[PDB]
Design a protein around this nucleic acid. Structure first.
Ligand SMILES: [Zn+2]
Lengths: 112, 135, 108, 87, 246, 156
RNA sequence: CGGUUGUCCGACCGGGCAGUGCCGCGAAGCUACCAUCUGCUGGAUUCCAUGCCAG
C-alpha cells in the first residue's frame, strides 16, 4: 500500500481516506479532506491559501535544502529481497525520524 | 445471453433514465440519450440508474446527419458521480461519457477519445484495446 | 505482400532450449504436472488457492514464505529503498559529528 | 417491517438474554460458550483478500470493523441444570 | 505452432497477457487455465509469472516490453512492482515510468531490436524507453490510428498489420521495420490484432473464434512450425486468401 | 471449580478468524405507530479479525508495519475513552451504541463455512482522529510533520 | 471560524430592524437504495422440530 501526498492540503493521505479527482487530460490529484476538495473545485490557488504546505515551501519557513530532503524521493527500479536490507533501512528510519526532528528544532530556532 | 455484464458488483449509480451524456469514440455522435439500462431490477416507482461500465440503451440526439436519431445499445465509459472503488478510492470524472458498442462487444467507430474508466476496460476487453488512456 | 527497399533482416533470438522440447498432445499418459491437474486435484476454480510463494526465483531459497514491510511510521519504506543505503547512511553521519563539533544544539 | 419482530417493544432488561446455546457433546474439549464485552468504537481496515473465486484476489479490500473492549472476566459462581418433564 | 485458447468469454489473448521471449506474463483469475497453457507451450524453460498490474486484470494493454526490458506505468503499486522484479530473473530490467498515456500496451509496441510509439510522447520519455529496452524507436501512425500496440503485433520473424493500410504505407513501414509484413484480419475479421493476438519468438496463442485461413497466414508470416513458410506459402495459397477475404 | 476467583481472558474462550454471532440491544431513536429503537437483537454470522492485548502497546500494528501503537485514535474513542485492556475486533456493523454491554456467543451451527475457515492478515488500522478528518497514525509522527508551534516554543 | 451587509429613529453613541441579513470551510446530530454489515433450516405429508421476537 502507498501513502498519497495531498496536492492541495499537503496532508499525507492514506488508503480509505480522502477523495480522488481526475480530469480528461490525465493529471492525477489525491485529496485528504473535503475542505481542500472544494478548494480546487472553486479554482482557489494553493499559492494563495496560507495553510497549504507548499506555500511554506516557497515561503522559506520549511526547508528546501540538505540531503535528508534529497533522501525523500520516489524510487523507480525495484530491488530483490534481502532481509538485512530491511533492518539496515528500518533502523535508519529511527535515525531519520530523529535527525528530521532536530532539524525542525534548530531551524525554528534560526527563524526566531 | 442477455446484455448484462458479469463481474461488476456495484458502484454508485448516477446516470438515470432520461440522461444526456456526451459521446466519446469517433463514430460521429456528439451526445447519447440514455433511455433504458440493461440488467436493472424491476422495482415500482424507481428510475433505473445506469452505472459506469454498464450497457445502456441509447439514442443519438445531436450528431452528424448520417447517424442522427439512430438508436442502438451502448456502454458508459465515464461518469462524473463519485463512487467507491475497491482500494478505498472515492473517485469521479469531469463529465459523463460513453461509447457506442454492439450487443456482442464490437464497436462502431475506431478510437475512443479521452480517458477510459478502470472497470469499463476490465469488464470489456477490447475497450482496453481501444483505450489509449485507462487508469 | 510487403517487401522493404533495403531488404535486410535482423538476427532472430531463437534459443536451443525451446527448439528441442516436445509438442503438446492431450493423449500423452506421461504428462507434465499441469495446472489443470493441479486445479482439479485440489478442488475447482473456486477451491484451490494459487500459490505465489512457489513461483518466485531468488538467490537463497528461504527468502520465501516471509512477510514484507510496507509502511513504517508514516513514511514509505518502499519509496525509501535505495541500493547502497548503507553507503549513504555512513555518509549521512559524516556530517553528524561536524554538526556537533560545530555544535548548534547549545542554548545561548 | 418484518412480522417476526413486530409488535415493537422495549427491552425489559438492559443486558439482553442470550436465549440459545450451542448443543453439547462430551467428545469435544472443555471450553466456554460466551463472553461480555463493551462497545468501544469502530475503525477502518484494509485487507489482503485470499478468497477463491473472488475477483479481488491478492488485493486490498477496504472494510469497516468494530472495536469491542473485553476486560478480564472474574468468575464468581457456578450453576447446574437438571432435566425435568416440565423443562 | 499456434494453439486456440479462451480466457472467459472473449478471445483477445493479447489484452490479458504479455508474452515475450525471456518471459510470459499472464493475468490472475479464478480459472488458471492460461497458467496451464503457458506452461504447456513453455515447459519450464522461461519464467512463467502471473500478475496484476495497477489493480487490473488487463495486463497485456497496460504493460509494454521485450526480452531486454519491461515497462510498467505509474498506476501500479510497489507490491505489484516487487511482484514483477522477483518473479523475473536477474537478467531482465523492469522500469516504472511517468506518462499521461497509461495504456502502454497500446501506445508502445516493440520487439528485440526496434520500437514504435504514439506520436505525442514527451521528449524525456523516449530516452528512458531507449536505455532500458535496448531498442531504437520510430514515430509513425498506423492508417491514421495512434494505438500502435493494439493495431499491430510485432515479432522478429513477422508481423500482422492492420488490413486497411495503404500499399505505399505498408511498404514504407516494412521498409522502416525491415520485417516481412502482411495486411490481414484475425478473430473473425476483427480490426484489432495486438489486443486480440500476442506472439513471441517461437509460438503464438490465438482465440477459438479465429478461423483456419487466418491461422495459416499467422503460421506463415511468423515463421512458426518447421519454418516451411517464409511468406511464399501465402503467395502459393493466395487463392485461399482471396476466396476467404472477398 | 478451578475457575473460581480467577480472571479469564478472551484468549481462553475465543480465538482468531472465528465466525461469531453477537447479541445487543439496539440504538434508541429518542428525542424525535409507537416505539422505534432499543430492542433485543442477536446478530449472527460475523467474522472475528483480531484479538488485542493492551499491555503489548503495539496492538494496532501487524507484521507489515513496525509502528508500536494502540487501537485507540487521537482524542481516544469518542464518547467512550482510551482502551487499555484486552479487545476483540469484528468485521461488520455490530449492533448497539457506545459504552454498551456487548455479548458475544459462539456460532450455533456446527457446520462450518469456508468464509469461517478463511484466514485473515492485516496491513493497517486506521487510527486517525474520528472526531474529525484526522490524517495521522500517532503523535510521534505528528510532531515530526507540524514542526514547532509558537506555544510549544514559548512553553519550552 | 473568517469575510460581507444595508433600512429607519433629522443626524448620532446607541437603539427598532432584515419577524434569526448574507456568503465560504467545518463539527455534532439526523442520515442515505446517495454509504457499510448480517440475513438463517431441515424433515414429513399444511404440520413438526430449529433459530429470532414476546414472555
Ligand atoms: Zn460547505
Amino acid at each position: 500500500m502507498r501513502i498519497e501526498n495531498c496536492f492541495f492540503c499537503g496532508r499525507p493521505a492514506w488508503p480509505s481516506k480522502g477523495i480522488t479527482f481526475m480530469r480528461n487530460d490525465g493529471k492525477a490529484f489525491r485529496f485528504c479532506r473535503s475542505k481542500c476538495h472544494k478548494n480546487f473545485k472553486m479554482k482557489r490557488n494553493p499559492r494563495k491559501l496560507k495553510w497549504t504546505k507548499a506555500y511554506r515551501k516557497n515561503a522559506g519557513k520549511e526547508m528546501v535544502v540538505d540531503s535528508t530532503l534529497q533522501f525523500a524521493a520516489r524510487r523507480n527500479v525495484p530491488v530483490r529481497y534481502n532481509r538485512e536490507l530491511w533492518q539496515k533501512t528500518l533502523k535508519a528510519m529511527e535515525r531519520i525520524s530523529e535527525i528530521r526532528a532536530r532539524r525542525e528544532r534548530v531551524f525554528y530556532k534560526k527563524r526566531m | 445471453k442477455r446484455g448484462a455484464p458479469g463481474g461488476k458488483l456495484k458502484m454508485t449509480l448516477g446516470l438515470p433514465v432520461g440522461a444526456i451524456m456526451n459521446c466519446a469514440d469517433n463514430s460521429g455522435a456528439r451526445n447519447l440519450y440514455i433511455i433504458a439500462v440493461k440488467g436493472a431490477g424491476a422495482r415500482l416507482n424507481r428510475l433505473p440508474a445506469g452505472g459506469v461500465g454498464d450497457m445502456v440503451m441509447a439514442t443519438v440526439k445531436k450528431g452528424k446527419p448520417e447517424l442522427r436519431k439512430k438508436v442502438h445499445p451502448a456502454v458508459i465509459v465515464r461518469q462524473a458521480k463519485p463512487w467507491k472503488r475497491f482500494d478505498g478510492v472515492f473517485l469521479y470524472f469531469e463529465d459523463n461519457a460513453g461509447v457506442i458498442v454492439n450487443p456482442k462487444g464490437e464497436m462502431k467507430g475506431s478510437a475512443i477519445t479521452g480517458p477510459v474508466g478502470k472497470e469499463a476496460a476490465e469488464l470489456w476487453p477490447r475497450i482496453a484495446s481501444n483505450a489509449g488512456v485507462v487508469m | 505482400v510487403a517487401t522493404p527497399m533495403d531488404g535486410t533482416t535482423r538476427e532472430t533470438f531463437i534459443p536451443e532450449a525451446v527448439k528441442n522440447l516436445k509438442k503438446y498432445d492431450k493423449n500423452d499418459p506421461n504428462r507434465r504436472v499441469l495446472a489443470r491437474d493441479i486445479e482439479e486435484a485440489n478442488g475447482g476454480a473456486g477451491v484451490f488457492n494459487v500459490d505465489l510463494r512457489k513461483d518466485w526465483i531468488l538467490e537463497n531459497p528461504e527468502w520465501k514464505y516471509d512477510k514484507i514491510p510496507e509502511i513504517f511510521d508514516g513514511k514509505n519504506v518502499y519509496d525509501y529503498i535505495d541500493p547502497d543505503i548503507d553507503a549513504k547512511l555512513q555518509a549521512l553521519e559524516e556530517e553528524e559529528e561536524r554538526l556537533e563539533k560545530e555544535g548548534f544544539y547549545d542554548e545561548d | 417491517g418484518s412480522l417476526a419482530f413486530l409488535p415493537r417493544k422495549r427491552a425489559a432488561r438492559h443486558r439482553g438474554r442470550v436465549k440459545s446455546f450451542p448443543k453439547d457433546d462430551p467428545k469435544k474439549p472443555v471450553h466456554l460458550t460466551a463472553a461480555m464485552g463493551y462497545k468501544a468504537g469502530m475503525t477502518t481496515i484494509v485487507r489482503d483478500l485470499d478468497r477463491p473465486g473472488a475477483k479481488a484476489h491478492k488485493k486490498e479490500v477496504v472494510e469497516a470493523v468494530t472495536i469491542i473492549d473485553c476486560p478480564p472476566m472474574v468468575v464468581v459462581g457456578l450453576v447446574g441444570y437438571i432435566e425435568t418433564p416440565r423443562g | 505452432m499456434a494453439v486456440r485458447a479462451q480466457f472467459e468469454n472473449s478471445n483477445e489473448v493479447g489484452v490479458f497477457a504479455t508474452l515475450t521471449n525471456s518471459y510470459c506474463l499472464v493475468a490472475l483469475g479464478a480459472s488458471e487455465n492460461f497458467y496451464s497453457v503457458f506452461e504447456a507451450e513453455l515447459q519450464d524453460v522461461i519464467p512463467i509469472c502471473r500478475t496484476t498490474i495497477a489493480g487490473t486484470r488487463i495486463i497485456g494493454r497496460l504493460t509494454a516490453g521485450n526480452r531486454k526490458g519491461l515497462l510498467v506505468p505509474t498506476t501500479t503499486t510497489d507490491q505489484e512492482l516487487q511482484h514483477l522484479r522477483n518473479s523475473l530473473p536477474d537478467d531482465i530490467r523492469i522500469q516504472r515510468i511517468e506518462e499521461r498515456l497509461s495504456a502502454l500496451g497500446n501506445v508502445i509496441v516493440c520487439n528485440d531490436h526496434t520500437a514504435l510509439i504514439h506520436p505525442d510522447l514527451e521528449r524525456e520519455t523516449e530516452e528512458i524507453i531507449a536505455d532500458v529496452l535496448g531498442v531504437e524507436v520510430f514515430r509513425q501512425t498506423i492508417a491514421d490510428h495512434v494505438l500502435v500496440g493494439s493495431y499491430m503485433a510485432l515479432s522478429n520473424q513477422g508481423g500482422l498489420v492492420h488490413p486497411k493500410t495503404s500499399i505505399q504505407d505498408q511498404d514504407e513501414l516494412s521498409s522502416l521495420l525491415g520485417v516481412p509484413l502482411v495486411a490481414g484480419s484475425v478473430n473473425r475479421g476483427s480490426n484489432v490484432i495486438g489486443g486480440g493476438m500476442v506472439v513471441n519468438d517461437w509460438l503464438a496463442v490465438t482465440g477459438l473464434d479465429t478461423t483456419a485461413p487466418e491461422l495459416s497466414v499467422i503460421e506463415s508470416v511468423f515463421r512458426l512450425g518447421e519454418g516451411a513458410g517464409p511468406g511464399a506459402i501465402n503467395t502459393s495459397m493466395k487463392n485461399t486468401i482471396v476466396e476467404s477475404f472477398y | 471449580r478451578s475457575l473460581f476467583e480467577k480472571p479469564v481472558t478472551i484468549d481462553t474462550i475465543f480465538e482468531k478468524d472465528e465466525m461469531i454471532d453477537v447479541i445487543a440491544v439496539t440504538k434508541g431513536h429518542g428525542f424525535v405507530a409507537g416505539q422505534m429503537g432499543y430492542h433485543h437483537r442477536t446478530s449472527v454470522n460475523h467474522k472475528i479479525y483480531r484479538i488485542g492485548k493492551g499491555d503489548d502497546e503495539a496492538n494496532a500494528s501487524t507484521e507489515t508495519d513496525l509502528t508500536k501503537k494502540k487501537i485507540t485514535p487521537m482524542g481516544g474513542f469518542v464518547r467512550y475513552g482510551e482502551v487499555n485492556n484486552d479487545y476483540v475486533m469484528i468485521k461488520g456493523s455490530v449492533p448497539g451504541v457506545k459504552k454498551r454491554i456487548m455479548t458475544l456467543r459462539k456460532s450455533l451451527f456446527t457446520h462450518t463455512s469456508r468464509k469461517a475457515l478463511e484466514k485473515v492478515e492485516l496491513k493497517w488500522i486506521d487510527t486517525s482522529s474520528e472526531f474529525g478528518h484526522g490524517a495521522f497514525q500517532t503523535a510521534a509522527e505528528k510532531k515530526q510533520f507540524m514542526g514547532t508551534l509558537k506555544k510549544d516554543l514559548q512553553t519550552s
